[PDB]
Write a protein that binds this ligand. Structure first.
Ligand code: CB3
Ligand code: CB3
Ligand code: UMP
Ligand code: UMP
Lengths: 264, 264
């Protein structure tokens, strides 16, 4: 899509060569923002085929507070394979912090439920937030949260959300992330009887990997196509009852997919 | 400042009537981002008389992990009197989380010192972050962190930082917050022998209080003037050893000041 392609070109134009953890090398810019009016279509990149299926499973995996790739493998999702340990454990990452942030005094904060309640009984709150950046458990996670801080907002019956992604692999990761939260907004919006608003994406270290250049140029040479439409065949009792079969994608006519090696 | 006046003007045209935890009412938008290249000058609003004293004391206060308004009240800084308790306590706010974020297992993380080391030994890191949004303590705090999460970044010998402010009172707080972080950047920079880069400001609920409309139109009629230059007269041996008398501002020729009420 346009915002995405423009972000690619932006990095290409004013990015700086920078070494990195993986040792792969990147071209990066710091700080960026784009918006997607969910009412214009589900934001699923078209300049290359994307498997919305793997995205759904990763999200449902979070909403259950699970952090062992076992469930993912149960559905053929290999996105955690290069970092999980022998027991398929990544650590107290996304899921654990989302449903059960451990307080030093014994409590466990279920943030998703907190936000839900706020959206229903206090949509005006400016503190409707979910954070995966729990400093106290960083060292235990197999990898630091990329999408680490998001906020919800409601106005004129529309639900919006902005994500803060401290680190972002524009070519391989961004498309997953955008679709992820966009998806979460629909679900929340459905449970809270609200319409979908905008999904504001904000980034920190927005980079393009040295070995993703050729593919980026290939995608950037393709013309974006109409955005598809998210279809939820059923309204579950809670935001914790969605299953992969409840989601449907219509009108998605993406360009051929493009493979690229991930930096471990 | 141009960017600030553009944001202020945007809230007017596109803003939406909302209601806040303070029966004051507001006109807000959700999600915005501005960029301040510190190389062009210290970002201290000029279309309104301001001063660093309070901002300086607060930051030094934060850097010490202090959360009691004694230091502030001492030098006559009232910014936090309307919310502290009979003992001057605000609870575990900003400074507490910055210098001693409590893990779930009896330990405390000094995020500042951590970042200090990350910039000196691992500048390419995409995990140099500081958060005050400790979910397990949000209910022990007198007030929820507005400037709740920020990140650092290095490139070509220049330190840059981005702040995620989930709640922002455009007329009153923004000018304070902006110059506050800018200052921290210059401080971190000196402490690491780096030069200052960009201060990226990102906001969630960006509102304009309904009882600030008059002073907003007044400020909008003024022409921004050249930004001033910051001078740190001494180089402490620690980012925690700075003294109020270390800061100077040269070339600040602002328009008259504008008084406004604080939504409690
Ligand atoms: C984001 C996210 C979730 N994750 C988590 C995750 C973990 C580490 C990461 N590390 C790096 N350097 N890039 C990422 O974006 C990244 C993302 C993913 C991880 C890998 C792939 C991946 O390589 N997909 C390939 C191959 C697809 C396939 O197997 O069919 C692709 O071409 O998309 C996708 C998602
Ligand atoms: C941010 C921050 C710290 N704080 C914290 C703080 C707490 C609650 C808030 N509440 C609201 N509605 N907006 C804010 O910006 C805000 C700021 C401050 C609190 C008050 C003032 C204040 O009343 N300033 C006046 C007078 C300043 C002067 O003496 O020149 C002003 O109009 O500037 C400034 C900062
Ligand atoms: C992390 C996973 C995700 O949800 N999205 C991504 O974009 N990323 C990328 C960022 C970076 O290239 C890598 C994480 O590495 P690091 O922790 O920033 O060193 O995956
Ligand atoms: C909080 C303090 C700060 O450092 N900067 C500010 O702009 N804010 C403002 C935001 C909001 O108008 C008010 C706090 O409101 P709430 O806690 O989000 O309801 O202070």
């Amino acid at each position: 899509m346009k915002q995405y392609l423009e972000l690619m070109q932006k990095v290409l134009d004013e990015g700086t060569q920078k070494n990195d953890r993986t040792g792969t090398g990147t071209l990066s810019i710091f700080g960026h923002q784009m918006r997607f009016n969910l009412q214009d279509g589900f934001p699923l990149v078209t300049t290359k085929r994307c498997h919305l299926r793997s995205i759904i499973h990763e999200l449902l995996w979070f909403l259950q507070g699970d952090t062992n790739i076992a469930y993912l493998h149960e559905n053929n999702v290999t996105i955690g394979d290069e970092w999980a340990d022998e027991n398929g454990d990544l650590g107290p990452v996304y899921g654990k912090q989302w449903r059960a942030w451990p307080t030093p005094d014994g409590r466990h904060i279920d943030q998703i439920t907190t936000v839900l309640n706020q959206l229903k009984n206090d949509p005006d709150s400016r503190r409707i937030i979910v954070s995966a950046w729990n400093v106290g458990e960083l060292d235990k996670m197999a990898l630091a949260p990329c999408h680490a801080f998001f906020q919800f907002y409601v106005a004129d019956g529309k639900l919006s959300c902005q994500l803060y992604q401290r680190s972002c692999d524009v070519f391989l990761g961004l498309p997953f992330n955008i679709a992820s939260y966009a998806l979460l907004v629909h679900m929340m919006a459905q449970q809270c009887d609200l319409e979908v608003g905008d999904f504001v994406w904000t980034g920190g270290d927005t980079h393009l990997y040295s070995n993703h250049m050729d593919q980026t140029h290939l995608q950037l040479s393709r013309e974006p196509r109409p955005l598809p439409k998210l279809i939820i065949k059923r309204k579950p009792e809670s935001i914790f009852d969605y299953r992969f079969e409840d989601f449907e994608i219509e009108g998605y006519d993406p360009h051929p997919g493009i493979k690229a090696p991930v930096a471990i």
